[PDB]
Amino acid sequence: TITYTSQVANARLGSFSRLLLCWRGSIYKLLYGEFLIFLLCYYIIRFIYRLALTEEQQLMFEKLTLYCDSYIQLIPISFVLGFYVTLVVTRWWNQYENLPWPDRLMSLVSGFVEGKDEQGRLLRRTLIRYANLGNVLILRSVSTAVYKRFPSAQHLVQAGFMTPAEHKQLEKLSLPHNMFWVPWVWFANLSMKAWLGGRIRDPILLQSLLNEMNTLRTQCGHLYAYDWISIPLVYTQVVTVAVYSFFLTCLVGRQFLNPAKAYPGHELDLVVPVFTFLQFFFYVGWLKVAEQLINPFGEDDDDFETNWIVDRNLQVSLLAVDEMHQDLPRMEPDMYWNKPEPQPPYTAASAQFRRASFMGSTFNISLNKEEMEFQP
Amino acid sequence: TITYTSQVANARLGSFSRLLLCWRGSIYKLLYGEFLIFLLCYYIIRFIYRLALTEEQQLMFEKLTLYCDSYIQLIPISFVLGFYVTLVVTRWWNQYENLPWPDRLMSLVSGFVEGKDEQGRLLRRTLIRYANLGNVLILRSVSTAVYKRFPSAQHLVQAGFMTPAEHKQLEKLSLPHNMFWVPWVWFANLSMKAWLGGRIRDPILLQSLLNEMNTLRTQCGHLYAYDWISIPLVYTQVVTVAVYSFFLTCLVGRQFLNPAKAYPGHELDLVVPVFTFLQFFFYVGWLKVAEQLINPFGEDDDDFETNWIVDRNLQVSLLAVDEMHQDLPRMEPDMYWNKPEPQPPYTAASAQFRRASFMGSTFNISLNKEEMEFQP
Amino acid sequence: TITYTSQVANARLGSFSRLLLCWRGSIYKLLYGEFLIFLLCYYIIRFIYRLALTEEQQLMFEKLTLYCDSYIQLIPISFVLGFYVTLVVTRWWNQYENLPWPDRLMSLVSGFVEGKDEQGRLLRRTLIRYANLGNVLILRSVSTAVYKRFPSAQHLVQAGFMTPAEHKQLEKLSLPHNMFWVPWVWFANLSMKAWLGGRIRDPILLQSLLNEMNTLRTQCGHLYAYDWISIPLVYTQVVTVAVYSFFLTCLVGRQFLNPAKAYPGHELDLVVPVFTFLQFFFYVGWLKVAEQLINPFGEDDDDFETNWIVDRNLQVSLLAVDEMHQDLPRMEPDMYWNKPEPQPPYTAASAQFRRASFMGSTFNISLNKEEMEFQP
Amino acid sequence: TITYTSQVANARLGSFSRLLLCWRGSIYKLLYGEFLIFLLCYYIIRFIYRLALTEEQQLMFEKLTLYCDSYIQLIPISFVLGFYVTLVVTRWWNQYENLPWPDRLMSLVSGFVEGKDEQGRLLRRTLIRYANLGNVLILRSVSTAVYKRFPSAQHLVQAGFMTPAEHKQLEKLSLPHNMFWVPWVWFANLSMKAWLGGRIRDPILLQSLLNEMNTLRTQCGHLYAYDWISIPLVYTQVVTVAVYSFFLTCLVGRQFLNPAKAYPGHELDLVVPVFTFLQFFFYVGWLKVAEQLINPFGEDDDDFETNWIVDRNLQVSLLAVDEMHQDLPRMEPDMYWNKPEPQPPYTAASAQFRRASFMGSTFNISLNKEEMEFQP
Amino acid sequence: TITYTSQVANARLGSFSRLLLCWRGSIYKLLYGEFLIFLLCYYIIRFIYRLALTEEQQLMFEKLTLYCDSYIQLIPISFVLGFYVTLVVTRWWNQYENLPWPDRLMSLVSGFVEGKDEQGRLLRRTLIRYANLGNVLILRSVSTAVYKRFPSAQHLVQAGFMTPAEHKQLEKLSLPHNMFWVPWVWFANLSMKAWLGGRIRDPILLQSLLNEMNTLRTQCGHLYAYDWISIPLVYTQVVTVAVYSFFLTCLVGRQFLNPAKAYPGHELDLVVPVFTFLQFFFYVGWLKVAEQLINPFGEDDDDFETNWIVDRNLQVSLLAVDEMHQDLPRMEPDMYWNKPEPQPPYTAASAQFRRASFMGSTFNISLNKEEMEFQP
Ligand SMILES: [Ca+2]
Ligand SMILES: [Ca+2]
Ligand SMILES: [Ca+2]
Ligand SMILES: [Ca+2]
Ligand SMILES: [Ca+2]
């Protein structure tokens, strides 16, 4: 993930222009290889047309180049790119939205599962650990970076996400499908045992805990689905054919013909087809957007930081359920205790942001006295 | 389903170009027959124009070809294809999203329905079996592959989804509509009986169970709806007419006229209309996207793997409710038991993914000492 | 509703081409009258230009025809048609999605409302009948076919949706607005009475029942809203003006001018403007999509089958709450009772659908032994 | 709101053509003034060019007119209009969707809040009145028509939405922001008092009541948000500049040049630029769609009928909570009491709508006997 | 936020035209600097071409200008701008939708947490303060204006959002990630303690409180996500390249060539390329829409008023939980106490808004007596 939120906070002079000076996650890094190949091919065709061919071959080539430049079109390619890239971006955001965060569940576990003694600590930590374990199982199923971190279940044991007893239990249950769902069943059964043991005081709390857990299960199922059900291959191939055929046609139809022939549009032979290069930048970069985002769990600069999420979720959830269990800051009267209309101060840098309230669009409507009278 | 997620994890050099080497679920497999017919027709017209016609007939044909190539348009067809294919793809993803998964329900059944004895096993298995049975009833109503697997209710009995007693009960209840809804009523009544019998300890658990079950019912109703309410026939016919009329017009308007006449754009007769073939590939493949996805429960390469889902759901749900009922890995202190800030290690291949946390976009803002002072 | 789901299960050779042989719900049926009028007008203009006009009038007409064909544009019309038809189709699917189905509620009523005696039957049937009654009240408010079936409340009494006592109660409550909301209030009050009478054992069940009922109420409110708040008239008029002005302009600008004048593009006078007819088919059929779907509760071939839904819902809900109340198939061990990994068999026709599980996109990643080592 | 749902129930001959005969909420009413101004300006330019200018000035003007007609473009304007108007229409429908209806809440209040005595009536009426009061407070904040009806809080007292005691309490609580949120806090506190007083029998009913109330609060918050956060001014200005610059350019580039000069496309001087007028109708009406819908709570023909909604909600909610409280039609066996498969009759006008059930797309698949055999 | 809702309530004559007279949040303010730079560059090129170059250099320049104006395209740029700006606007509205409002939670806290004594006040205020504190922590993480107001946690203490004890507790818990989640855990634990202490009477109320709190947590998580996961840099760079390359090409291809050469389209040298300036206004303003909205939490005129929201939420929530706790207006019979059909009056200005109810689209259907008869 390349974050440039702070650079575009305001619409300043050339806001998006400055973003062109970026390399990581940039268009340049994404398409320099394809552009170099296109450059090599274009100048190979130019050299062959300028040296190898005879006069009659050059005339035939010039006719072909005019014919090809007659057949360059930007409406269908831009259309299909817009629709396809829009689909890819929608799925990309949905995939972020199905990343499980344990925060709601961990607040419930910290509150509901009672006991500061060793059994209570053990129970709360085990529950939140089951949630984290299910999350990491699916993430290593779908993310290359997480898989590289945890290439085997033994790695999950060595890294502490899974105890040896849990690993053995998982191996007992093994079915010929991805076993990421198992920690949710474990969570449900341990939660039931906790309620029966008196660690959960009331079944409505159990209901809440299992609701949050199953929300996490649904998010993980959506992650599995996006990993499994690719955007249909035919659609990707269609868009790819459109783009690559455009630029293969440009390989000939954008040649600078011999200036001595004085064809229309070929009066001058500038060596560099700059506008064709700009079209390459546009269209191939537009395609590279989809190429990068189609699988947002790889190792691209702008792919999600899954390993960071895994680490953060483990740290925060364990802290929440263990150290913060019934551990509150002292409750004391706040600064506005007897201030009916609190007005927190502003700094010098923020004073201009003090706004009067918007009361509604109808607030300033002017009505005459007769207009306001209720009729019988 | 053709999964190429792993091939497009990163935006590598020619990522989408390599996908052109695929055959299963490819554009080639989808449109080779239509393309061969188009090839045959185009070259039939060429042969007739080059041999059968007289000089005056050839002049008339050339005028017609110029007139037809005047009338080739790409804006309306690409427009309507974009909108229609977008609708088809939206419905396709929605149809995946309404595939029932028993996982949330099975966690609830494993936790809530008590008793390791034979009656408890029987009850839990029966409940989860009712869920699976309803799912398979709708799926065989909507999916050709599942119907081929279970062409009669007796097949569902022979395959174990339905007991003979359940089959007889279903035949007693028969109405002249699809009876896929019956297992939900059975599930509700059995759940009520379980609560009254003491197998479910508290009515809030019953409420949760029935909520998950009815979520599955709603997903099945949406599956029925997509099966029943087709994309309106007129829309499909409109898009089809646009595409096929484009290429019927190309059958004449893309002929290479006699080079001896020296018409504009016909200076050279290359035998193969390569750019017209590329347009065919684009537009007809774009249409084939909709043709494949419009009914995602058929036997296309990229249709959903419904039979696999049925098998997996049965296996996993039975395991969850029977073998995993109150069967937990031993609860023991985890590796970070007295580690306040756990840091799971990284492998060599994953070490570069260790990221510092993003603290927020405002983190690096610089403010002078005077700027930070609270004003009175 | 015209269902062609089975005809498009696979992307077969000319899948969408075969759909052109349909008449019901087809483009042909939708626009043959408009096309015939357009044909009559076009050939009237041709006849007048070819017979009535003098030479100078013909020259003026030819100049006008060239001027009009200069002003034919496809970008704005296709744009506005795409956006408007997309809006219509979105609303059409939403309107299907707000059709009330009693199935979730009926499962809850069958389970929760206790008593096989006459009072229990009466209570369950009355509750589900109130749900069906509210649904039919809104549907007859919004659907022409349902209104034709039930043109007065007395028709609802004669058809059994409403008892005479209920009809009298409704007449007592009459307000000058649509009274479709009344059965929900009746349902709430009867449910409360049932809970107080001991027929509902616990208030959480009452809560669930009322939640399902109010979901139905919200769907009915959305149906009322779509019936009331039309797509704004100005938008419909804008799209209509675009399409009809295009083809009124074609009435002159697509005339085949006198071939003797040898104008550009008029070298040959083929009698039939076939490409203009294809444009008519495209654009007017595209518009007819919106015309058919804008009100999906009329009598078009592809309008929803509201009367069938009403009948089915009544039959199924009454069966569910009365005959199926605490009426379960015998609970017995299933076929996979002691089979830890059940594998339901496949038929010959379905054996090729047996798939291995997709384990995740990262499953096949190759890592060296050194790469997998955890670093310190 | 202009409802034409009944006029477009079926896709009849010229369905949308007949809608062109409408005046209220029509394109004509929306843009006749702008069109008249455009007419005046165009013919002023024509008169000046035909009378005031000398020969050299006319030649310069003709060159300018050709240059301007070279620069008329329809792709960007139609693009930006499509996207912007689509955004406006999406927000317009969302704003309808956030109109609060008390119906779910009123069913809950009628059922749950017990007591036919004066205190019970008073309590139920007060609760539903608080809901209606909050709704009217936000609506008068956002709707010009409602504000004109209730220009002061004293008007709300005089109209009965607010008692004098409630008005005084509101004045005590006054903060420098819109106080529409206050009735929800009042509702919560009165509901709590009702539960403590025995008027609400069980806290789950209290939970349900407050859930419905807070749903209404969220809808009101969304109404406030749409009122406050306008579509960004720059977007509106961009679309406006595009449209108005198109037609300012048309003011010169669509002049009919002197026919004596025989310029291309100016061979005939028809006095009326009819096609430019049709473009005006299209593009300016398309813009007028956004202009009307951007604030759907004003006084346009197609703005929401907020005052009617306020009146209806008050009437229906008071009836539901007061007259209909525990007031049910007599419960008696229905007409299909001993009819296992009820078939409500059809009228003559509706008999053709009797449909056979759609059993699913797979129903008609043909399989040989060998194909159906389960393999080992 | 620039609110112009009241200015566009009705579709009046030149409604959007009047909006062009705005400066704050206007297109002019957003792009005057870029436009001035473009003006300087264009006229520099004009001056160089008119003075510095020789005759042969001028001929070469004229050929280049014709070549560049051949390569100006509006379809791809408008396409990509439409899609990208649509994405930005969707995310902008979503980001408003994830702004936490405490109103639902504060109603629950005011109702459920009992006790008018000092401990009850302290408890209610502490809970609502925890909600506000979490909200301000995330907002200062994501909003530049809020960060400028609260550049350190000590500022939050000095401003009263955080007590010193809370600040110390936060410093004890510090992890190397954003600690905005901590107040939710505190809220859960304090709520649990309140329930155990008898301040919350029943666990269903606790469940409701924690549900509302966790809704706020999810909204804050979405705010963090939008702050962290920028729209991918490559997409922004692609759109920027398209726009800026268009206008860099215009710098040469829109030059007015020497009128003495009499090139096509260059017959007259008007000094100002007005239409190119209008294209600049359109396209660059369209881009500026995204530039302003891409980060809606900066200091742009149309960015959200986050500081106002913070202040309002604190004031209203403290009032709701402290002063309004069990503080109700006197309950008395309302004005329509014995009025079965209440009709609140209308003012003179609003009388024309009195509407008859829309009864449904089918209301006016005419049926003959024979048509209405039920057939056997
Ligand atoms: Ca901003
Ligand atoms: Ca990637
Ligand atoms: Ca298919
Ligand atoms: Ca219809
Ligand atoms: Ca309005």
Author numbering:
A (entry chain B), B (entry chain C), C (entry chain D), D (entry chain E), E (entry chain A): 2 to 377
Quote the study on this structure:
Bestrophin-1 (Best1) and bestrophin-2 (Best2) are two members of the bestrophin family of calcium (Ca2+)-activated chloride (Cl−) channels with critical involvement in ocular physiology and direct pathological relevance. The bestrophins are a family of Ca2+-activated anion channels consisting of four members (Best1–4) in mammals. The overall architecture of hBest1 and hBest2 resembles the pentameric assembly previously shown by KpBest, cBest1 and bBest2, and retains the two landmark permeation constrictions, the neck and aperture, in the ion conducting pathway. Ample electrophysiological evidence indicates that the neck and aperture serve as dual Ca2+-dependent channel “gates”, as disrupting either of them partially impairs Ca2+-dependence while disrupting both makes the channel completely Ca2+-independent.
